[PDB]
Amino acid sequence: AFAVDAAKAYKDYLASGGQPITNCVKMLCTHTGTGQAITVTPEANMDQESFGGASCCLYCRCHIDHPNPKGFCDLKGKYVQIPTTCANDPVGFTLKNTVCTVCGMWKGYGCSCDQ
């Protein structure tokens, strides 16, 4: 029944005041893209930075299994758009946030489906 909980460990280390994971791979792009969360090519809008997905994934970066029966990563090989105000901790951001499954935006950072 024992399973390492890296997501909780990272969140707790963040709350404890620890420096976020660095060297996430920021891309050059136009910053006129769709603004959607996880895309096949950089899609940052004016308010976002685009990063290489694997470098923003806690499980890729820590060399630990992905928490899914299928050991699948939905960031690896894609680009993740991070609000510029959160871009100092892309890994923490992708851990703590959810993609709206109808519009593809981050809940609370672009998804207007609830208005």
Partner 1 sequence: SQAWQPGVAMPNLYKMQRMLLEKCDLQNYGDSATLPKGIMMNVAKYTQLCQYLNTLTLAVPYNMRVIHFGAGSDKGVAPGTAVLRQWLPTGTLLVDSDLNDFVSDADSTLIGDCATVHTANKWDLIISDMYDPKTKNVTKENDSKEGFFTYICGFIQQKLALGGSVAIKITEHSWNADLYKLMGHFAWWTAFVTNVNASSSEAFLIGCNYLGKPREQIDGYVMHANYIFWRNTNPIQLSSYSLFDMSKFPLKLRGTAVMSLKEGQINDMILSLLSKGRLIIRENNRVVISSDVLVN
Q: Residues 8-40, buried b or exposed e (16+ Cβ, 10 A)? A: eebeeebeeeeeebeebebeebebebebbbbbe
Q: How far is the CB of 19 from partner 1 (least distance, A)?
A: 14
**Binding flag, residue 77, partner 1 (CB under 8 A):** yes
Q: How far is the CB of 102 from partner 1 (least distance, A)?
A: 22
**Binding flag, residue 98, partner 1 (CB under 8 A):** no
Q: How far apart are CA 50 and CA 21, in angstroms?
A: 16
By the 8 A CB rule, do 75 and 98 touch? no
Among 14, 27, 38, 103, binds partner 1 (CB under 8 A): 27
Classify the C-alpha dihedral 77-81-85-91 as positive or negative. negative
Q: Which does 49 bind (CB under 5 to 8 A by kind): partner 1, Zn ion, none?
A: partner 1
Query: Which residues of the shown chain bind partner 1 in the complex (CB under 8 A)?
Result: 22-30, 40-42, 49, 52-55, 57, 60-61, 63, 76-79, 87
